[PDB]
Design a protein around this ligand. Structure first.
Ligand SMILES: Cc1cccc2c(-c3ccccc3)c(C(=O)O)[nH]c12
Ligand SMILES: Cc1cccc2c(-c3ccccc3)c(C(=O)O)[nH]c12
Ligand SMILES: Cc1cccc2c(-c3ccccc3)c(C(=O)O)[nH]c12
Ligand SMILES: Cc1cccc2c(-c3ccccc3)c(C(=O)O)[nH]c12
Ligand SMILES: [Cl-]
Ligand SMILES: [Cl-]
Ligand SMILES: [Cl-]
Ligand SMILES: [Cl-]
Lengths: 212, 212, 212, 212
């Protein structure tokens, strides 16, 4: 596509997008065009408005576009073209990505005892309510656990809420502690969001006993 | 995929799917699996139910699956496996396609007079509220008009309702009447549904005057 | 989207799209924009060309866009804007849908004998190589058979060729002939294409014997 | 979906998936089912093989599934069910995600001089050939630069190669240096892959002069 300003909008919150170069107040020669999950290709929106789109996105007095409550289907491209009172045309191009932050992740069915030298289920980490899905990862004494490493096995599951579309993730960790290891290792699980610069969320740690 | 019974479900109406081979009343060893626009791959539903799926699809006492009001996102595959009291396992496989019937199509901005030998806009046909989109087509005195045949030009547009997802179609017909033709031709437009065996809907005819 | 000329392009064949209002020969101030399965939103193509797109779609000397061999991923929207030598700007807007015609459909595993009053497998109809998928339907003595009617059952299956993406459809018909019916009914199966105004393809008929 | 082992497969490389619990050599009672970008819902593959799938994925003598060169369309779910010689059934469930590593990112059109207190284009970072798209981000003297923080503006662009589907990303950085800042700041850009645990790639730094 073209060069755009990246916008991240939290699901359920309002979004205002500026129409650069629009006069401060009506009358304004400007048009918004959007291509999102709601549209078939481009939809044009104008300051006059009208119709079912008035429930979803409306042009404000200063020419900005306003969505009262962003949904998953509002992901897409939003563009404005405006003429100021001198006749200069200015374009605005936005790429809108939407997100939701899950609840704090939790470890369920954690083991209190592990046996060295054999596979053990350590626990299941669960995160509910993310968009985009994001990922779960396990840590041992502050270091990432890698499933490709020997003695670590992970299985993962993704589900969607049938009404909101938000993701629930589940990650089951199994480990084979090596003979002579730490008898009280500390495990935790982290949720890493799908979008850049969003912070990870971490579970409370667990500390099983390992039997030699 | 596998062999399935095809099911067409009107948006907004309930749907009941039979679990073949299930005992008539509980207790029943049966499981439903669905893969639809609501799910990430397969979701399992059981007679006990529970959780947010209880608002969307529930297993009934006789083991059938019930959706109180089908939506676009319920398109997909629905499967049951049941054991009867004899121990025999029976599988049911359904492919569910959803639809909505638009309002009767209308011709707007129809021309009252055409001039022979030059291009004329005849009118614009509009259909609102279909799923899947379907198509619009023009007829002249009961015969289909085919674009790219000489003297016929059509342009078409598709939009979606931002909240319901249903389609609005628009079709603009232009013709070049051939000299010596009928001075009072009769045009109409028809909506053809996307699914098989659904009936076409037709507009009232228009009858412009052609000037030689 | 906007009003467009609908274009149907057969997979594997060339496609030429006219840039209306472009000068007959270079130099030309014109630009093509396309949004297809190949692109992330709009891609701009110019008479100079260059790069990997030169293998897929190139602007010709008269300004038309040329694709030597259309694929499934070329479905989408193609637009031109040109200035003629007088300074007038002209826009062209095309909605391109692609298709492939399957081989003639065939009935396999047809029954030679049916028993009245009980369910019988009549046969399986198969169509290979369509795009979009299209549908199969059964006919009895020239009349459509409807699965919603008593004594008719149909199951259907869709597969895709892993390399070409073209669809293979299969339809299995079962019937319960009513006591006292025709002892030599004639069945056939028809493939109905997904796009409008494309012709159906029909199998050779079968003529089982029915036992009272 | 169900619990699965997550598998990451580099585009263009072979992939082997183990059928757990299968006998070491034929004969084997086992079946693979796949649902990927190539399939309509599930496709069953068997040790005998045959047909066009033999060019894409084949069952090996030990029952493993083999793809000689993974493509984007092989993303999806791969499952095996096998019986050993004892009669025990074992299931294997894999979620396959595909990727490609882009070339090292580069900064083009970097500025040699910036002026304090006014917006300046610093440069454009470009990464070619990734899957999934991934993201570009700017750093100043080793610290992430965050847009929407005062004096930082970023615009971004995504394109796809028309034949391979791989992504090219472009990111243009503008900054307003604050008066009294470092006259020789050091900027760099990093590519962050879409999949977890894949390493970032970084450009060579640039060091413009800032004029007070
Ligand atoms: C590349 C690019 C960036 C920002 C805005 C636009 C517009 C536009 C948007 C709203 C109204 C009129 C034109 C167009 C077009 O449609 O030509 N291209 C754009
Ligand atoms: C090919 C086919 C047709 C109909 C039902 C199923 C089921 C199933 C559905 C619900 C519960 C348990 C199994 C499965 C499977 O998952 O093996 N395959 C099926
Ligand atoms: C609604 C509509 C129909 C046909 C062409 C265009 C173009 C365009 C196409 C190629 C080059 C420059 C502009 C645009 C735009 O981008 O504004 N809108 C269009
Ligand atoms: C939940 C789950 C995990 C792993 C494999 C399967 C299979 C399967 C796969 C290949 C062949 C036969 C059955 C099925 C099914 O289809 O019932 N469910 C599975
Ligand atoms: Cl789900
Ligand atoms: Cl729309
Ligand atoms: Cl398939
Ligand atoms: Cl692109």
């Amino acid at each position: 596509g073209a060069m755009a300003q990246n916008i991240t909008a939290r699901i359920g919150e309002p979004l205002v997008l500026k129409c650069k170069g629009a006069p401060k107040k009506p009358p304004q020669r400007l048009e918004w065009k959007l291509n999102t999950g709601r549209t078939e290709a481009w939809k044009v929106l104008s300051p006059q408005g009208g119709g079912p789109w008035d429930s979803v996105a409306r042009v404000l007095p200063n020419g900005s576009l306003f969505l009262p409550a962003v949904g998953i289907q509002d992901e897409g491209i939003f563009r404005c073209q405006a003429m100021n009172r001198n006749g200069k045309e200015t374009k605005s191009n936005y790429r809108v990505r939407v997100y939701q932050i899950p609840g704090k992740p939790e470890i369920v069915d954690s083991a209190s005892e592990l046996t060295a030298g054999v596979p053990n289920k350590v626990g299941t980490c669960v995160s509910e309510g993310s968009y985009p899905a994001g990922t779960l990862s396990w840590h041992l004494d502050g270091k990432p656990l890698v499933p490709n490493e020997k003695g670590v096995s992970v299985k993962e599951q993704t589900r969607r809420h049938p009404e909101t579309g938000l993701f629930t993730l589940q990650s089951e960790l199994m480990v084979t502690p090596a003979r002579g290891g730490d008898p009280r290792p500390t495990f935790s699980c982290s949720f890493s969001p799908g979008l850049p610069r969003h912070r990870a969320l971490r579970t409370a740690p667990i500390q099983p006993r390992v039997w030699e």
